[PDB]
Symmetry: D2
Subunit: 115 residues, 4 copies
């Protein structure tokens, strides 16, 4: 698992469950092309998006459908989604955890990069 | 003024109005002594807590009554308050803005230090 | 003004000065069209992006060039930028403050919506 | 494990390792009495602070020594520490994760409450 996504809910104090997540990689004509997707589990985690072989250096976008999440809970949200855009670099072996903390009118995102 | 507190509500996307704020200063005997207090305004800001003459070097505590805020909106929050503890003016007089962003189960705090 | 952007540096405890900000609006053909741009001031604020006449209903994107900011301070950051995407003015004209708090491997964004 | 603490570093994009954490419970004379402590592991986590039998309803404080952490990395910090103060309540079976995201001049904390 070179890439994992974890989503938390700051209103309820819980994992954010069944949140749709899409991953894109930047193409040479500088358009975004779909790469991987899924929904967060009961622990708010999304595992198995990609493999070591496929996850090469490049520019990636992780888009989290926060609007549909808040809509399901009956709470008015501000953002259309949360986008996280980064360059993946080989130095040594790497694992990426993209964590997002969600509120209706705010979100925070951090990258935890290990190995 | 040397010390200002600004509080935001991450659920409503608004200033957090009428929030109680209590400031304490550490004495020589290592106890917390009452220093200043007030309520946030319509803009979520609290000005005029202290003066340049009064705000000497020391360790200060700013305690924001987040629990009473959430409860008056019908929400039972996780935290009792948001507490910020810091050493002030140790390389000379500065101006401090203490900002807090509030959610029922989470908060962030930042300091902007100038001059 | 209808739209203001404020950027803070969580490492230095200061406004984030000279930060590039680009605003886009979604067209009928679903592409992003350039709307407005500017640089944050000494206070980390960007005022005067648009007017009440120009800032109609739609989906907007605010892209903050966080990478160039960190690089000029000698830090190689994780994210390419901080991107905020939202529907504006759909229940009538409002005033929007978009705040971003920056760290090399993390950022938070909040909206304060009034009037 | 009814109570776990997890600490992240927003400057380096990593677990915050070897951070001292102290837990207190509020006594009837309203003084803070030490309860449990330890240091975060290589994954930034602190497990085994207490047991189901000992962790009764009450008011608790978790104090994270953020200042010593930043000092070890050679970076000037603002806060003396991060304090998280909450009421533990029995409803159904509960697990508490107190997560903290650290920057030199800012911190965020969230509670993830499960089972
Ligand atoms: O710090 C903030 C924040 C802010 C943003 C993100 C956070 O995590 C915390 C506070 C929001 O609006 C402001 C508005 C201000 O006028 C001054 C500020 O310092 C802030
Ligand atoms: O809460 C977080 C955060 C996190 C993210 C943003 C914040 O503002 C605060 C914490 C990051 O990684 C985690 C990773 C975890 O396994 C559990 C968590 O609760 C978190």
């Amino acid at each position: 698992c070179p890439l994992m996504v974890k989503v938390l809910d700051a209103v309820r104090g819980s994992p954010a469950i069944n949140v749709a997540v899409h991953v894109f990689r930047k193409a040479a004509d500088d358009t975004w092309e779909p790469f991987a997707s899924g929904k967060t589990s009961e622990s708010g985690e999304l595992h198995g998006l990609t493999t070591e072989e496929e996850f090469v250096e490049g520019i990636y976008k992780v888009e989290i459908d926060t609007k549909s999440y808040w809509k399901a809970l009956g709470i008015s949200p501000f953002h259309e989604h949360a986008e996280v855009v980064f360059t993946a670099n080989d130095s040594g072996p790497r694992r990426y955890t993209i964590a997002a903390l969600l509120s209706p009118y705010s979100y925070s995102t951090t990258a935890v990069v290990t190995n």
